[model samples]
Target: EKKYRKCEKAGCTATCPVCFASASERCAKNGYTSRWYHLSCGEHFCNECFDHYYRSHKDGYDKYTTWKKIWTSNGKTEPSPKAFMADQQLPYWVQCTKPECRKWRQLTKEIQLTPQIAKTYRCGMKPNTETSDHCSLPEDLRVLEVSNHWWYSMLILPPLLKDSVAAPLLSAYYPDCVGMSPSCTSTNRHVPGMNRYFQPFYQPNECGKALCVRPDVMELDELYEFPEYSRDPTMYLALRNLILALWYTNCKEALTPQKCIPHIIVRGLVRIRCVQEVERILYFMTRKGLINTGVLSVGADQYLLPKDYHNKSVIIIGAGPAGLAAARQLHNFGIKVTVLEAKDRIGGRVWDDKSFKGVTVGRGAQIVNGCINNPVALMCEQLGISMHKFGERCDLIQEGGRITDPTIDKRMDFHFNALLDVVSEWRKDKTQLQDVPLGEKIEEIYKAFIKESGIQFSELEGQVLQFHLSNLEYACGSNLHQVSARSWDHNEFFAQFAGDHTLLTPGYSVIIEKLAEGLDIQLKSPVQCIDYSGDEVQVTTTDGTGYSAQKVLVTVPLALLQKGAIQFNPPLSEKKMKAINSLGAGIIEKIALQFPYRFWDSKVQGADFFGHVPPSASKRGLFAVFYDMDPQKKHSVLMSVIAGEAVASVRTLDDKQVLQQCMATLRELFKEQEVPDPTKYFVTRWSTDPWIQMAYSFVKTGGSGEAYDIIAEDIQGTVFFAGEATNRHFPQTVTGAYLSGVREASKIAAF
Candidate 1:
């Protein structure tokens, strides 16, 4: 025979309502109590499901035992014995109140126990027939009034509660109550001790049981006065625990505030307006430690929302990294957000191509610029995406397929850095200098360095120096002559993400895919105009569909705004317009080539990247550097960067011509080996893409760093801007764009 929990009351043969285990089966005694009896509901539950409820559901244990009458059997019933104690020989009406014998006792008049001795009965003795059991304990008077209404049905409870008295309460609220569905008959109400008028609504065989929620009880004021509402303030927290528990009980999708809220609303269990109250209850529950859940966080990054901003709505243009991040943060704050994208697909400038033999390759934004304090890196780590770490090593090759002398290379590295430090220090003394192009300042500084070091300048040394210039151009996404000497690296002094620059092995699209979960993104809806003159902002897409929200955030690239892609109804301020136009719309293109076999690997196996000195200074930016796409030697692919004046060639020159120019450079760098034709190639035209006409933003000549801050300023608290360009401290980087999004989200919340 299977052992079951033992009961103190002898001859009691009852089975647990959940597991149906007989109470009389041999088992260890539990302090003179049994698992079959529940004092809270005057019912029974097995220890297994009861323990599982608090373990898995995070349901508070104190409330499960001490709460007064969540739900009992439909009809009036005697309250459970205090501490599950009962005397069998005594009639059901007997009571014994002595200190040691505070329990019911028999009153058989066999000895001196007679009606005359009723008032004098005490301890180890039987009660007189005249007195009730538990002699003179004054029948602790507390009554429960059974009600007939739908309020009880709508109360969501933990799944294990289905076998308790709460089950019949659900019956009185769902199909069993007067409703549009077919009413249950008397045959369905056959459970022992259950009211014959009401059948248990939850099915015993089902995995997850759905409970009814009365729509009217959503109001906190009236809800507190409801008959089922417990007097304890902690009972208010049960709503959050019960609703959140449903996520793990029967949900197939991952848990998130955006997903969970709509699931309950669509199931007809909650109205849309009640979502604010639900969020408030959940937030309060978290504060009180009644429940623990991450659905309220923005992607589990630990950025919390201060309160429920559900009544506010926002529309974000462009579904790039910045806009998506802001949308996610705002949505988690209970704000309604809608993202509109101009292109047919999302991920504006972050593209990952999977066509090259199923190997993931990034067409844009592949590098994790700084892995230490970078939010993008943190997010990638959280998502379990591996990255390839890059060391500060680059192979510098001259025109004759010969690597540069290590002695001169090492000397020039320090010399070039010293030159930059002098230029930065010169800017500190503005009275001794004037605003000029960075290239001019570098030339002047190089001349002074040559004179001070007393070294003769050689053609080879100039070529080596030009290689550094080309790399700088790649970093700024513009020719040095157009970049400002005063503010080009002004943000470097700030607290930027500092660490080794690494390459995302899976490409940036994976991060985009994970962050865009359950977001309301509408593609091919290019916004043409934003009208924020009224209390609410009205955004009109190019296709003429209009969207109105409390606020709108613009995350498009600076080039689009410069080209007047989106028009403001009342025209932007002159200061804002000047700031937008002053910032240069920088452009950089990439060329990726896939080969049948690795030809350059044997020569430069340890180097992650290699620099090539152009034939002349005029073509320094043409195929400046090549990055080994696969460091693991798994795939033979190389991506070359094209910036500075060479970016114009990508727009003017045909694909064949561009390929020929790139091959000519490679042939000069590796003359000893015969180069084969690339099996496949990809050339980017970011400048030509209407949605994103530039790579990022940079400080132009005669421009100050204040322009970035000015451009980021919101107009009338109704329209906001966020992008890489809006980040004054870390512009022209993917991390900057994400932080800008977070910055704008916090600003919107305060507004």
Candidate 2:
């Protein structure tokens, strides 16, 4: 053989022409009867799989079936390989840097080891890093890059563009000239220069264990020598590059937001996206054994229902927090859920009414009553909903008028806390204090301030007592007399001084809206009856539309249950019915007024402003609490409340009378300054709304916490119960309602 015996005319610069043009980092020469291969990747492109396609699976390097001997047994009791891959522990081999179809090994497991060698091996190990051995690309990526025209041929365009109808259009992006087979997909998609950006390179092995990935050809069959640590660094950079490739895939798939993605994981989608590829590569890896089934969230994303129970579905009545929350949990598990709402909206009593123009305020459940240990409050950060501490931080409860006196204020806290101490004991043990209705407890205590000698309290003292008792009534949504101190949860203290009461910034409906996503909701479709006694649970809407499911979840308000608006076929159990009847549907009517401009002093933190006591006993507690909206802003709004039975009078009263009285109180309080006149008829007639006949549920004199539990109890695995009224620890609160849904859905999921 001649020492300088080279072909007179070069057939191809690379033995693997396609791999050389599209993927090879090392460009080497070759010529053997027109056959081609890569010097770096060490694999010959078979005719059937050359240029345009990868060969037969497992038979060639492209088969997913024989991909790793289907090595699934990573040892786990619960696993669904249908959704994931398995069998990946020791890295197998790497492709040699030669034109021949050869394989090389790193000798990861030393049959015998030296301390220095072992240290080097351990240093090269990346236990948590996930990587793939085989690199795959969409068809339109024949040449991962295109710039310098090497070994050009005019006849090459036909075989490449023959399959592409949008060949000319694709040529602008994927011009795979100079041995590059111009590739495009059935979708006719391709990014031009991205070919180079996405090209897979052989990041050298380290610690004696690693993987080899080449976009075009990688058939390792020979071993290599390595001793120094300065080659191209190690597998750490390999993982980082893998992540970059994954980022490109994500960008192509529209799985993440189209933002300025960093080359490395700054955070967010890159971290999430890489894991998906890593999982696919190490399908049978022990780490991939995690059972990923149910995942849905609204407020703070924590509910696990069966991930796919489409056939075993449930019909949910009412689209309030309880109903929507239950639906969210079920939907996550692929459970078929259809939420039926009587009205056109959700959040029965926890909604922000948008029907009124120029008004956007939370009409019901204005604030998250307890930010501390408050589930709704606790979950706010993850929900994308902001929580604002608002209720009564700088609030002043004036006994005589809005003019606050520190002396009276200090005494009020002392007296208020005195009762709180007693109620706390009572809540822990019902028999601790001679427990009775809170109204009577206060009246009995109020009498002590007076004497048996017929001595009466001063106006200031009596007004303070009235404010204290009425505030508790407002919290319960029932007059103190109608509420039992023994059964009362006593506010979780959601204390006055810490001012920890939080408000949902985007309104409660924001969370409801989030949960309703990907859920089937039929609005304005009132359920006429639910017949769950039969093998199939049937739900009939008022308009004659009917649906059937495996089960039914009743998440309507206690008021609806008490009113028997949505009839149950077999009727609820006597215990549940008793709980429903015993629990009171408390109404607290509110008047929301928007002023054209600001009127209050900026120093006034109008989150909660109490006092401005009524001179007459008839309207003493009525409209006692008032909150300022946009306190320091130009567009001022105010929300005034009328709790207990007095809400009835406020509901029937004309707008003029309500406005006149509201303005009069404001003028009396701010007599020294200017108080502006207000417009806007924004008020709630929840008691008369038919569908939601009460503001919320409250524990009354006859009901105990056990009754609340009874209301929450499941009839069977089929029919479930969840609502704010069902939660004993925190009733008549948004968190109570939300948590109740979570509780019920979790139970159903487990069942």
Candidate 3:
């Protein structure tokens, strides 16, 4: 039946087994009816020469025949004369799927060994029978052979079939395959395939006629239809080995083929194709619905008390500007409000401590910055508070044992003006820029101005820079380097200056007390929880008392909020957490000393004196002097201001230790033989206090001004934060806190 003839070449014998013809009619060289040669040397020469050569190169002949047995007979059948050696020399298109010796016919047996001679034998050569196409279906439908193809192919099945049939079928047939199936299912079906021989019920079609169609499979839209036989194990293993080799080379140092496969599955960092498998696996184990987290709820206790609960009204947490302003605003609106102050007396950091001297002095926020057209100035006028202007009496004490005239002061002012102009230019040049630390920018400006002015200054300019930088520390209750330029600029724009720097002859806390008159409040009530799951927020206090309110206004300091001292039913967002952490609450401490007599001269005002003593006196000492409270009185008190890192460090010591250090520093500064002992002395440890974490907030380097906006933003359109730190315009100042409370209260009222 075979048509092709073989072997017209010399020294060839043996007929084609199927056609039973002689060497001349069956060999390629002699024009045989079939391409056959002697079974012994059938791979190259004919049977006659193979027998003759077998006696001479018997080992080579046996080796070739052994390879043939391993390839064609799966190592079961022993080599015989009838066994075809030609099958072992099949072409590139045909080869046993086994790992070793996947050789093609032309490679196994060449007509000529050398390239020049082989070129002549290349034409008219046909691929061996084993090299022909194996798939019964059209090429498009023939499932590509690949590793884990069975698992991957089943993933394309319809939801029902994938769940009920395909997944189970692949699991039973291809145990090592990694694949996923859909959740919902319809019915079971049977299919006739190689896998069906293991489990008859696992076949696609029970009738075994339509190979692709199954009884249990559902037919949905076109795209949802399942394709049969998308994988072939033999080809898949071969391709897998090739891909594995490439992958091994690419990631040789980082990963090996053995380690990479498992790692990709566990980390969920695998490629998209693998990710689908992981998702499907997870779905199979747990069918629970996906979670959608909701927004945090604001507490009811933060705003109003219940109507039936003893008529107790709002209880403000602090006596600072924010609390006082809130009380005043609520009072004006005919709402009951009362302030519960932690300190024995209130004014929050602004009141003058008269225990130090007869004369009243502003302890905090002394400047009333931006006095012109300031809101505080306007408010003071309406309240008939007295005010005064700062005279040009400023002087500078240089580090090089020289006293500079007031001219140095004027130069400093000019320099600042020039620096502002430069910063303005830089701002204008850039469309968008991140906030820079003000202290750093100011230092650069100081250097440039010193060069431009040609003042021929020594260490004085650098010392002056320190003094200016210190202003930020005093202003924000934080270190200079932490303050942001953008925040400082914004604060400058909206800064409210009292028309004049005047002391409240009596005390500033009087205003706060007056504001709280005749208001309903619950003292000693600390709120602990707020539940907003219902229409109104239900606030629970530390004593477990609950109060419901429509809305709440939060005026706690930024530091306290950051600590999460108060619990919300739902936790705050990550963005809120980040904003709270970035803000700095700088330490500002005030120490009051009560003296029997004012030995110091009236002419010696509270002006800064640098290097009054040798630099070696105290490594931490920066500013040392007293604020002359009662210039007219013989016996008066002096108050000392200590801020920044030094204050925080000193706070860790006891009161007696603090007093001793203060006296020692004073003795060094004035070069006095004996410093006067204090009759009574007290220091406020704001930094160490648990209730009040820090004095006030300072803008930190690289922190965004937009952080304030985020804090000010209301949560759930109901609960709001109002504090000095949350105020973008003039944070860290008393007036800023006051305005913030007022603005937030008004917003709450409107809501």
Candidate 4:
């Protein structure tokens, strides 16, 4: 029986089906009481309609008769509908479980709808039935459309589940029901993959498809055993919906539910308090063999490589996420591995500094881009690192000390995104074959938006527009003019991480430290040449020390690769060289300013980061986004990103000049308030770094996504490439690099 719980908040807008009276008007007559009462048969009604039904309908009459008798026995004269409704101890009307016979079922005895019974009990699902096989059909059983339940709105899709990275994982469990249309049928048809029902089986009807569970693969007993699921079934149902929509669309789109379920799942789990719990649940499921996700490894026991491959030796150049993850996996698989990092550190771009005195701040790659099912997030859990959840609260403070009106801020935000959509649509229009800068097209669309919306552009609004563009530049790690509009989102064809963009509280350095553990790492030993021409691969470091291995994995940054920093004996294939040249090495730097006191209202406004619209367009990238490093609100440290075109110019300034410029920009934004000098400052010059030379990589105009695929190709099975640049589906991310490492490890292990 469906549990009918009393609602405490404002009710839905549904009116009475029989009387056609508004719920509000009917409830108004009852001295403004609860608008609707839910029935056990997944029906809700206004009191007037329910009262009319109870006095007229046979199904309701039967339940009312039992209730009236019980009330009369107590010497109560003709119990009112309100009195009957208030009695939670009475037997309630429930629908039969059979699809064909959804007739109301009532009990002669009184009982309450317990949570367990509400989930377990159904019509004809009793130990003993008064009639022979009460709802048993001699014919086959099938399901069709059903009316929406009141809880349907409360429990729906959460945004975190739309991540495309889970595509392959979900695809593994997708049913092989080939002729199974959105309309489900009982007929058995030959599918390319399967012949029987599977767990999370798609069952479609009028109100989108439900991922109906099958007991064969995942039993109800086990599902109920999951702690999170048992605690809140509604949120679990929402998760089920998320999986259903993702699978049905083949990871093309996630379902959007009607409303927010009281229990928010991913968004709820991703909070600072609940972040640890999500990790616990994931680890629990993994250990219990509830999931078959093989991408992330919680422990060495999760290694996929066979023991026979353990004796093989492999050399991994560059101890970045990809190389480090690869090395760790290889070592766990019993393979003899050696990691050679050019820099003294192992994280590559995932750097951290303790220059701020107390808190550890990120020099590069701090954000867990997508917290939901992300490898970086999983590692954070495994390593017990805290993550600060970032919200959509970017306070846009313009030059001359004024917080832009939120209405205008949001309008520009919408306009910016809408402009991107327009650019995407234009990219699809093959009639226009010319390739162009993303910024070029976006500017065109922005002018069109202004003309169409009839909104006059102001200098302050232009700065806000530049603010958005600067953030976009940080995403691409390059100037808008350098980025290709056509292929910018090509990696989106495959699923990318989705969910809350979290800041690693301590820094991403913890992840690197964890990955670098129990490995043979020779830091500051830069590899200058890789001679894979012989039977055994020879890697020569800058010091001229040569090392031999069966295979050498080049996880060098794209910038270094583009510069041909490492000499390739029997030079790299022409295709690989072309790919290297086709891709652009991008750069974005960070400057951390340490002050004595928290003088900004950004943290007070609940913003993890705030935007600063530059005084001019040319300097937009100077310090666009300022991240609040002081989570405790006790410290006064702000990390500003030096991105896009400004990176080149910013690098030209000395430390003193850069600090003065940054202070000047801050003063301009906080004209009414006092802007103090920082006690100390830390800045990164990634573009000029001898070892890295660039922040990340991006697709230039006329560049093809195929460049990434080509770059990832191995040479003669003796040399391999793995890095963010080589990752086509997930690029320019620490997780992407990590995944590539795991990929190359598997490849090397197989060899």
Candidate 5:
């Protein structure tokens, strides 16, 4: 009565009871293989739950007998898995959707592992290693109690789901699977936010389904073309057990199975596939980091060393963000390019440093400001780096005291908002506000707001004005009078995020290193002179080593151009020089002190739990803004960032003196508690660093917004310019510096 004999071999060994056949004839060597019956993600219980289910389905052997046989579909289900440990057809990977980072490499797409493997990982080199047998949050985060084990690692707590940012977008394409559906749903409870299941849903139509998209996802928006993920998603986590993985490896050097999984998902991709496809994607990518997600706006199957690589060439000076980004794009076009760095490392002003016992801290710019649609933020997303958003964690301290008084806090925010509103009006009426400094305009309108609003200055309403007014200075690298008023709206084009700053947990230098992959980068080779007078561009570094290329891009900071650290043969054009002179290189300093303990932890009720600091800072130049490493953290690290131009005051001061100064401020904030010296400390001497003269660049008082054009415009296209100062959209930030390079590369690539 059946299609064929039921193969009810009574002598069947290792038999599956359900199908009345031996394990060899029923499935892969194990129940969990490509041929096993699948579930619709009822739960993780890898709906590889079906594998065990199939193994159990065998329990009713004769009951689901017909169901056990392979149905005619996507492919043949082999009776045995004695061979073909992997798929016959190779798997594919999804490229990072973000265009700015990891553009070429693909990752094998792996599905979520079964709960047993997912939850059962141990500590150390062997996840299967007996050490880290069990782990969770609000619990043993420290070294496991097992006396024999000395090492272990774990992913961040609260599983990193594809969060709200990507879900709202990806949900449209994979609706049936990205939902509450039984076939493919959110049931894996082991990996925090990543509990959602991924499994194939197509059936009965004689068509096997793949996430490979078509005109359906596109024909929508220009910003949507980069479907593979071209920018950084708004991340919500912090630095973790990574060495860190990102900073220390290249794509070829990177992309191991361990690194691939987390790196791939962090791109904000939300999709599900059959075990065979998922398994192949995983192994395929790890084999060489190649996977093709449906979105072709993705990976590196195309683009190679140009056919005329020998004929075309570019020399990019300075291995900072801008220079590095340009090198990456140019190289992708098959153009021969060389990157020269003055320091032993890259990232320029966006750099990092380590101190006592390897406590790492950003030496230059740290947090990604205004990150939505921001390039650096995009790269972090593409590369799978995580970021942390501030959660009302910032305390608006005023005059050596926390702004706990609701009325005062409310008023500060209110007045600050008021300040912004009036400034925006002035910015819109640029002609009327031109040549008028923001500081000058603020004083005039601020007092008027105070009087018209009938607010008393004694509640220290002036304090509100000064605090936010100082914030204005901190935001731009210059004091109110030093910044150009016309440039107020110049940065408006930058897509804004939820007014939060995020730190790249692995460190900013790592981002630079990641971007510098596969290029000829010569570190410690500082450029001394540029001669673009001839057809061949020649550059001489401080070491007197000379190199020539068809074209050279200069990515030095505004400080160097202003100082003429590198001589240009015919000298830069007058307008370019004027723009350089008109801009201001702002200085910011930081004091990181690892205390014996968090002595200054929050004492106020309903306040942020991290340690303390007053608002942006004292007018006298002690650190203005300070924050604890983490709220209720096991360790203590209080970092103070000076926003005003007082780095000169803080510069040259030894770490102990800086610590002593920090102590003075801590004493003021903690009047009752006796302040103690820090266990150790390190002060960033960016202002004093010979190679990088200051922290960042901002518009000076006498200039128009045209400096971006004048400075960024290349000299006859042979000698181009790029850096934060030249960045039209994102000055005073890393993304600006990076995007500046990309823009120049696009120009020089001559397409």
Candidate 6:
């Protein structure tokens, strides 16, 4: 049989390259070598391949390892058959000598040697270490004397020994040395090369003695063995105790040892065992804490969790139609809502009292003015309430103490139509009327129209102009001078579909009460502060109870909000404040008188007259709108009205003074007919009410409608203002307030 010799590749002895399975497998036959490769592109190369590459690439390879030069030189040298057979039993070698010794040494000798030399030489014998014959050092150290001095200088000996015993001892210990120091105190202390004068300032103190240095510095090899008794006694005791603890604590003692190790480590809080184990224990601890308590324990890098609306509540601050409507919508969405009211009842301004004459009489919001699919009419029908048509008779016009003739009326209508046409034409031309007040523009247009018409007015025609001014004041419920002419012209759009003034005879309060039914309404509980700093808004009542919700809808009157009845955390914006400040409150008063009999006739005309009278004058500034009590009867009751700034004076009069003035006005309208004294009378001074600071909001001339828009906008997901004042269309009316509330509710629902 022919005997084959092994190729001289450093650190590789297998005839054919040994394959180790790894994550990415390689095939030698496919021209794909293992991670190891030979410089000559040899197949199945190992660490010997790298050595070959180094020798071929640089001159240093030949100086250090002879195997690298031989391997790269294409198998110029080969180990004998005898050497190949013995190589399996021989230890491997490291490529470098100074930093890494690759020759084998017994553990007993390694323990007695200095740590630096022992670590270098001992690690060289490891199965995984690469072996080469080359010496990796400077050219100066390649010389015998310099190399001997480099080794001698690494020993901690007296200067005299360096030339004698130290130099010879180190020469004998080369290739793979376990050079020991007889005077050394510990097994770890050592120095490595010459220049003893420049040796490390801090030397290992445990040279020549067994000690537990950090695991990182220890050189471990397969042949190296440690005594059983030298193992850490404390670590063994901890493991035994931990096993006992787990067995006693858990009923499932049948659990495998693999599972028990983790359980014991977790119970003992041992975090250094493995990275994944440490993370697992920490995650479980955090979950336990969070689950036990209701708080969410988020890490520093985590974001806030989403809010759970299932655990939320809300509070509404008003109880009017708007507030009730908001509450009903919120309650239907499964939100708890509490409604607060300052007044004894819920209707705010709309109230009815039947104790006066056993008939429903409204304290405020009596007339459903100019309804064009009005929400109030819809609400009234939904609540099954009855409504009556307001008086629209045009018979009651008198000028200079005589009733007006039909010819005088036609002429007045003609002139009013002509004036309207001119104003309409001017409004269409935006350039001619930009930024000009409607009143000024109307005056300009009226003069032009009058000059073109050249129609002379009768005496009755003059009084009709004054009546039209009074109608504007009554429509806005403010003084004519304070009303915006532009707003009035725009308001005329409501009349385009015909003036359909309807009154809820049973009072508007019933509508509010019905809308409030079945809602989660907590009465008399006012929210004092709202803190929206968390995932959900937190509303705090005066009683210290807090309610949280996804959102809140505010429907209080703008006047009450201006008074600061409820405090907001951050202050309101300047634009909202300005809108509240600029809002106009129309002061209106109403007096209702019930006579012993119907003293006024249906044929009696609506009167307009001005007289210079004393402060106690009975027939002063009285305007009446007659309504038929029974259509079959010829008689009726008359309601005399005085509003705006003039209402203040009327409110100052006593019951007798009001009655005398109302009766005298009826007597004057009926000519010489006798006017009966009222059997019952009622009056309301809304301005004096604390809850309702004003009756209604009227847009004054020169006021921007943008003020209302500003107040209506919700800021930063908070402070939503909804009321009649925030309504862009049909403001200053109950229907407007309802519509505003619905709009805000829709916003809340969508959010």
Q: State the local distance difference test value for candidate 4.
A: 0.63
Kindly give the stretch of ten consecutive residues in candidate 2 with the minimal lDDT sum: 82-91
Q: What TM-score, to 2 decimals, does candidate 3 have?
A: 0.51
lDDT of 5 by residue, 235-332 (tens): 11111111112312232232223333333232111211221123333332221112211001213433332243325789999888888888876766
Over 1-751, each residue of candidate 1 has an lDDT whose tens digit, in order, gives: 3534543223333222223212223322232233544322212334443343233353433443332132132322222322111101011212243445443333332332222333344534544423234344443221110022232232222111111122223344332121111111221144354322121132322322112124112336335433344432213322343343433232223333432332221111112222334555554433321222212234433333444445679999998888887877677666789999999877778998888864677888999876653566556545656788886778788777998876666666667777888888878856313678887898899898778889875787777777777778888889888888888886775655545678897888887776677889998999999999898999999889999999999999999988888999888899998889878898899888888888898888768888887768778888888988887877888889898888976788888888888888888888888877899988888989988999988988878778889989998888999999999988887778877887787678765
For model 1, the superposed segments whose C-alpha errors exceed 4 Å read 1-307, 431-433, 451-454
Among all candidates shown, the one with the greatest TM-score: 4
Top-down lDDT ranking: 4, 1, 5, 2, 3, 6
On the 0 to 100 scale, the lDDT of residue 269 in model 5 is 13
lDDT string, candidate 3, 199-298, tens digits: 2122332332211222122224211222231332221221222222222223112112222222221100012223233233222111110100001111
Q: What C-alpha root-mean-square deviation, in Å, does candidate 4 show against the real structure?
A: 17.9
| Superposition error at 63 for model 5 (Å) | 39
lDDT of 6 at 67: 36
Better of 1 and 2 by TM-score: 1
TM-score of model 2 vs. true structure: 0.59
Count residue pairs with overlapping backbones in model 1: 14
- Runs of candidate 2 with Cα error greater than 4 angstroms are 1-311, 353-359, 372-379, 391-402, 419-435, 452-457, 490-499, 602-610
Clashes of each: 14, 27, 31, 4, 36, 19
lDDT for each residue of candidate 2 in 1-751, tens digit (9 for 90 to 100): 2212132224533323331122112222233323342211122222222322233432324323333232123111222211111111111122122223222222232222222222222222331211223222121121211112231221121111112222222222322221112222331233343322222233223111112133222222111111211232121222223333443333222111111111112111112222232333221111111111112232223222212323467888888888877777666545667888899877788768664344357878767764532445434533535665664444444532355565665677677777666655645655523457877776665466455447555776666656666677777888777777776663343221122665565677777777687678999999998888889898999988999988788888778888888888888888778878877888788877767665664536444444556545566557676666543344567778887657766777776787787788777666667776775657667778888888877767756667778888887687888888887766777767776776776666554
Which regions of candidate 6 are displaced past 4 Å? 1-312, 369-373, 390-392, 397-402, 406-410, 417-459, 489-500, 518-550, 561-566, 602-624, 627-637, 651-656
lDDT of 2 at 309: 26
Write model 4 residue lDDT over 277-382, tens digit each, in one string.
Answer: 2333333332222232222333454333334556689999999888998887777666789999999888999888876877889888887776655666556554
TM-score of each: 0.61, 0.59, 0.51, 0.62, 0.59, 0.51
Instruction: State which candidate has the highest lDDT.
Output: 4
Q: Residue 554 error for model 4, in Å?
A: 0.4
